[PDB]
């Protein structure tokens, strides 16, 4: 029964370098549309899969940006977050022993997810030397015929890492040799850096068929505390996904759908975004230069705004090493561990604060790496 | 596995909306606006945000009399009907029952056949003004039994419980040692002699009782999705640990309009002036249901009456289907809600004075002229 499932899920001057979200507030014109909306009168229940105006929207930009042909009125549904995708993707399809492939470090939610549709998550490491993208040759140690799915975040959170156009080629080519499907969330697409492009799976041939693509609007716009998000995937995978809305959430905070349909529209939220990716871009090189210099060795990632500094040579655990940031250098960074078993040696920093704070909290795990001598 | 328990669910004038006409009072909306002036706009506790959840406590105590406190025993969650799937989660095992009093709100079996349970109907009877009755429980418990939801004032019925009535099942909830959820979200809209109670209230009742309210119903803020219950420690740890892998938590900036509507003398004021709207329907398409020939119980709470339509030869499903093209009028077969709703209809007055009186005249004149009587 569900309630089985959930007892086996668990888990003054300080700079919090912990954070999970957007330092920046919602663009300004985007209040103003959810005020106008309120003003309009969009009050009242509206479909369980979403305004069609908002899933029409989405279709135009998904094709546009990420190559992704999706019908507004089939295939693609509106969420409360793109964090309710996890559980209802994978309980439109998920039976009771089935194995779902989670690369590590992973978000948190992803194994819970599969937790409580009733399946068995199982871990695939990525590697630092790697950068820590996925391998298809770590995924082929994992797989048994028990697995019916594959869980890909790309950028990734908590690595800030990107799969090249290549490495879902691959993957595209294990999915479809194992007949699994892919659930690719894509939250953090726009904020990326150098060189790097962001590729949607679903885009390859033949691979729409086979995957819940999944999106939002929190990270993108700043909008974590609205609550928007969408999946496009196959129709079957949507029909069942409203029908558990029903006995869920039944629908989307309407005038949140109408602000955000008409922002997708604005060339001021294009804007904005770009804004925001440069100045995260800037913060980025200052965690990346300044760890190193302190002798903490670290991947330049090239997507979201985490980094994450190797710390097991400083001699500790990833959870030791926490504890001693927060006590001594008050700056709180979580545990690598906390992502996975591949996360333990590491630890997440988010660089969505104000620079100074950053080069502050920077200084301040500086002197206490020195003065206790680990250099 | 939760894939399989999925498998196993589911010129008119529309009377079969369940949801305010009115629209949301202007002064929350100007709450709305002002918390995205000031930025409420991030992530907040998966709980809800402690400003509303005091807000609730103290509405609790005076309006219910349910202590409850903040911290541990109030969640707000993304509309009241989450609290029946994630609510139930905190405890059903695999094939425990449900009981549930029927006719009934359809999320109820969906949300226990869900969480991995059986849902049990429990009849409830127009000659009795279609309240639960304690000898109807008697005759469905089972070992097997460990809740049971409750809805006053219901929909579809329109019948509210009387204080005796929570006081006898009370009885059989602490005699069977099952929990009960309560949905009180129509709280407000009572009529006549009635008077709206909450199990909860009772004698040790609060440990045993999930109760569930929210907005939508009483301030018409159906597409604002914010709910709440309160609840013994145990099952609110359970149910927030769901949240984070359902939707997080509900929108910030809503929250805080919320709180502050709570705290509103204009809030309370706007809810008089809706439920004397609806008393004035209510009146107009009671009466005018009964002299048109069709048996209706004067319903004394929510917003919706459910008429008596199997004297017409008709099944609720046929009846509907003939006021729909014949009448250009659509209200919902009584079977949609359990079988006990075999027989009769739902009707809501929750649309204009106007389209009532219309609509009533629609469905006389074809009744009249089809010889239905
Ligand atoms: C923030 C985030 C999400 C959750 O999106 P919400 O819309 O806020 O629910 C999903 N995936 C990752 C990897 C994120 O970091
Ligand atoms: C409308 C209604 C609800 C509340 O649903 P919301 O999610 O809060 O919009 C709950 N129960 C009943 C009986 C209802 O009629």
């Given at each position: ?14 700079i919090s370098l912990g954070i999970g979200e957007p330092d ?133 959170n908590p690595t800030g ?27 953090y697409?726009?904020f ?27 990270k ?60 995260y871009?800037?913060r980025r090189?200052?965690v ?13 990632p090239?997507?979201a705004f985490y980094i994450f500094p ?21 700056v709180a960074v979580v ?12 630890v997440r920093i988010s660089y969505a604060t104000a620079?100074?704070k950053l080069?502050?909290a ?14």
């Amino acid at each position: 029964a569900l309630s089985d499932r959930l007892e086996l899920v668990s888990a003054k001057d300080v700079i919090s370098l912990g954070i999970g979200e957007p330092d920046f507030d919602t663009p300004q014109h985007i209040k103003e549309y959810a005020k106008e909306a309120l003003d309009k009168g969009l009050t009242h229940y509206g479909p369980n899969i979403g305004l069609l105006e908002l899933r029409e929207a989405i279709a135009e930009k998904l094709k546009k940006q990420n190559g992704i042909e999706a019908d507004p009125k089939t295939e693609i549904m509106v969420l409360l977050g793109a964090n309710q995708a996890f559980l209802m993707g994978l309980s439109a399809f998920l039976k009771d022993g089935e194995e779902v492939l989670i690369p590590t470090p992973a978000f948190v939610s992803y194994a819970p997810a599969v937790i409580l549709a009733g399946g068995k998550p199982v871990e695939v490491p990525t590697y630092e030397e790697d950068e820590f993208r996925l391998n298809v040759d770590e995924l082929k140690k994992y797989v048994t015929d028990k697995t019916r799915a594959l869980i890909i975040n790309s950028p990734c959170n908590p690595t800030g890492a990107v799969l090249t156009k290549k490495d879902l080629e691959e993957i595209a080519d294990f999915v479809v040799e194992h007949d699994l499907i892919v659930i690719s969330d894509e939250v953090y697409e726009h904020f990326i850096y150098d060189d790097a492009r962001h590729y949607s799976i679903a885009s390859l041939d033949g691979m729409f068929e086979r995957t819940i693509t999944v999106n939002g609007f929190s990270k993108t716009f700043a909008m974590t505390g609205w609550r928007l998000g969408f999946v496009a995937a196959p129709s079957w995978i949507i029909e069942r996904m409203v029908k558990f809305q029903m006995y869920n959430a039944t629908c989307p905070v309407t005038f949140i759908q109408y602000a955000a349909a008409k922002a997708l529209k604005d060339e001021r939220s294009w804007k904005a975004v770009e804004e925001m990716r440069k100045e995260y871009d800037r913060r980025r090189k200052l965690v990346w230069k300044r760890l190193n210099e302190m002798g903490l060795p670290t991947v330049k990632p090239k997507g979201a705004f985490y980094i994450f500094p190797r710390i097991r040579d400083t001699g500790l655990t990833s959870k030791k090493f926490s504890e001693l940031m927060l006590k001594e250098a008050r700056v709180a960074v979580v545990p690598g561990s906390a992502f996975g078993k591949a996360g333990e040696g590491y630890v997440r920093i988010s660089y969505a604060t104000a620079y100074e704070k950053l080069e502050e909290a920077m200084e301040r795990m500086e002197r206490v790496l020195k003065e206790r001598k680990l250099v």
